[PDB]
PDB file of C-alpha atoms in Angstrom:
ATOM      1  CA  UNK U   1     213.815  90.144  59.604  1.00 16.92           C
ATOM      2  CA  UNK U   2     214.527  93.759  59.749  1.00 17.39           C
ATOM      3  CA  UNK U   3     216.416  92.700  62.659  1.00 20.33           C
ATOM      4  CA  UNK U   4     219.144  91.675  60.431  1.00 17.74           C
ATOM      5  CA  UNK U   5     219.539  94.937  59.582  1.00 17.74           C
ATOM      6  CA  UNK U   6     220.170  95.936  62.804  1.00 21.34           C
ATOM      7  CA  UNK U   7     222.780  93.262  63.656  1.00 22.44           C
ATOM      8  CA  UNK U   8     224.531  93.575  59.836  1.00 22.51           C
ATOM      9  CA  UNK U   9     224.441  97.420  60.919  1.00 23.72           C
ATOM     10  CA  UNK U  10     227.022  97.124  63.595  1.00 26.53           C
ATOM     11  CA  UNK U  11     227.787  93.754  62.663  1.00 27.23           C
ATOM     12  CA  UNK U  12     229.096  94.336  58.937  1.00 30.33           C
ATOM     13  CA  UNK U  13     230.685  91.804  59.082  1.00 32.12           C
ATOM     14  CA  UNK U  14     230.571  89.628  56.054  1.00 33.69           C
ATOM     15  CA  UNK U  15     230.737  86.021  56.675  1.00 31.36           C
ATOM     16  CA  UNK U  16     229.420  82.504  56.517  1.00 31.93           C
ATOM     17  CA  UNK U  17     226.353  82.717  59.889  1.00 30.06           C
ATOM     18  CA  UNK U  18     225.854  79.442  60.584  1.00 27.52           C
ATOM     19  CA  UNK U  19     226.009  77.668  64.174  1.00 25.94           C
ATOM     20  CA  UNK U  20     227.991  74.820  63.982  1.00 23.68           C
ATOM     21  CA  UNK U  21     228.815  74.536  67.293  1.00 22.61           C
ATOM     22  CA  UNK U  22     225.378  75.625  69.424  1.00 26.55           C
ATOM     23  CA  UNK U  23     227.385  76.837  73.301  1.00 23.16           C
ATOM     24  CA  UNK U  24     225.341  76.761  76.234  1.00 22.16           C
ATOM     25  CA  UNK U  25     224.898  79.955  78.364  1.00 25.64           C
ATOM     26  CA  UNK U  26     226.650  79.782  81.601  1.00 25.76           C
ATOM     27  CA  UNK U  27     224.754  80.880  84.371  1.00 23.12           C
ATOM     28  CA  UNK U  28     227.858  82.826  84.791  1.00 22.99           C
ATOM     29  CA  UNK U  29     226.924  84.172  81.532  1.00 16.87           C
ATOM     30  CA  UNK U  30     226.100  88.030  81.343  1.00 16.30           C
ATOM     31  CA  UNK U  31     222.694  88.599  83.382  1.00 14.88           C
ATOM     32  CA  UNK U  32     223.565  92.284  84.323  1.00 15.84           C
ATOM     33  CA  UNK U  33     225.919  93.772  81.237  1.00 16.34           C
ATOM     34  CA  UNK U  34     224.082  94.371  78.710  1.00 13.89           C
ATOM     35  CA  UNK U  35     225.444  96.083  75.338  1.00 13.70           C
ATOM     36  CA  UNK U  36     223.873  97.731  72.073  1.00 13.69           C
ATOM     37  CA  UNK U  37     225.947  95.123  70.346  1.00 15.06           C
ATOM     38  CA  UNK U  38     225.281  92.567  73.141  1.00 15.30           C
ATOM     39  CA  UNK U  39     222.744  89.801  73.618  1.00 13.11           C
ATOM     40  CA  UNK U  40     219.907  90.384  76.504  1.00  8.57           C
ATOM     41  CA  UNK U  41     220.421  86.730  76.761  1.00  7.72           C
ATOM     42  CA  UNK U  42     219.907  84.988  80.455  1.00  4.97           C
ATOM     43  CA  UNK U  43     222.759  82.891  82.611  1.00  8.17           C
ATOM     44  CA  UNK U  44     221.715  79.723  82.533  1.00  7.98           C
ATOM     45  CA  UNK U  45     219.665  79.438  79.008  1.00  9.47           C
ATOM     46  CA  UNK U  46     220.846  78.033  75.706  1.00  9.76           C
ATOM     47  CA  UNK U  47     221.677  79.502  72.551  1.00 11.36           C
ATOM     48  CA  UNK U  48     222.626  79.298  69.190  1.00  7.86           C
ATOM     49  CA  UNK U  49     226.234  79.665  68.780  1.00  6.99           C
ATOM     50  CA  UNK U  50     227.560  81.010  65.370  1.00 11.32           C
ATOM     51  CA  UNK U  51     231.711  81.483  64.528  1.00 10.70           C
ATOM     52  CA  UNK U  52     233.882  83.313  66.776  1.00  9.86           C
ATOM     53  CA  UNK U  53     233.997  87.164  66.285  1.00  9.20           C
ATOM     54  CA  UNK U  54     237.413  87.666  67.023  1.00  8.60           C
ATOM     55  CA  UNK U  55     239.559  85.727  68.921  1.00  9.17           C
ATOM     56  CA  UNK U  56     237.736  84.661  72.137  1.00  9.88           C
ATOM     57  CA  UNK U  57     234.093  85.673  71.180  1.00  9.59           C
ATOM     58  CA  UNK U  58     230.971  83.724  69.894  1.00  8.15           C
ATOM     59  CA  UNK U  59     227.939  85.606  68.198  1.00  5.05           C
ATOM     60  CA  UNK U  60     224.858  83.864  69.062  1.00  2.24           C
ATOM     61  CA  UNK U  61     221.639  83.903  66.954  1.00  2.00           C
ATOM     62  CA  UNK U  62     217.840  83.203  68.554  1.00  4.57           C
ATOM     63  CA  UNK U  63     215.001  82.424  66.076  1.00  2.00           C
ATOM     64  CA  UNK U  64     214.015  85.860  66.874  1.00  2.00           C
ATOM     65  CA  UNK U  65     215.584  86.393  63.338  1.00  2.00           C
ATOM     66  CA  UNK U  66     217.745  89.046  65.525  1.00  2.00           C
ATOM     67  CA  UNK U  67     221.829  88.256  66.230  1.00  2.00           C
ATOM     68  CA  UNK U  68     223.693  89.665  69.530  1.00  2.00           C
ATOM     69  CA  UNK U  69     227.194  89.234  70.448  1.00  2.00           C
ATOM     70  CA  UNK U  70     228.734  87.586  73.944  1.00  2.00           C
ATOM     71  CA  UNK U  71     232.270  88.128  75.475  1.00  2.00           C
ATOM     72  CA  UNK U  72     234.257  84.842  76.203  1.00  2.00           C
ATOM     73  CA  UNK U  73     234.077  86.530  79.900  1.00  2.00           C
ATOM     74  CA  UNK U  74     230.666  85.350  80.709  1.00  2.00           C
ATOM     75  CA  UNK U  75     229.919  82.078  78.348  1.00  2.00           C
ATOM     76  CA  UNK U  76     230.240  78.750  77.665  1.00  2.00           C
ATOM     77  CA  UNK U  77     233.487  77.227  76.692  1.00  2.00           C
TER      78      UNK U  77
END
């Protein structure tokens, strides 16, 4: 949706989305942080998890049809 746009925006980065392997949200996971370019995901829920941004980071996706982006600090493995 046009919340592609918004993820594409900051996230141009062009690549294959597709969650291959679907990480479960710690409920270590970020529950206070919260960035522009971060998910306002729960600890404790699950997600879709897509390819790694850079070297320890996973983007996940929700059927929201909008993307947000989680540090390897608080996540899954």
């Amino acid at each position: 949706e046009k919340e592609e746009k918004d993820f594409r925006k900051k996230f141009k980065y062009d690549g294959e989305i597709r969650v291959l392997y679907s990480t479960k949200v710690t409920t270590s996971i970020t529950s206070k942080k919260w960035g522009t370019r971060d998910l306002q995901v729960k600890p404790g829920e699950s997600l879709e998890v897509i390819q790694t941004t850079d070297d320890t980071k996973v983007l996940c996706r929700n059927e929201e049809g909008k993307y947000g982006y989680v540090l390897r600090s608080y996540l899954a493995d």
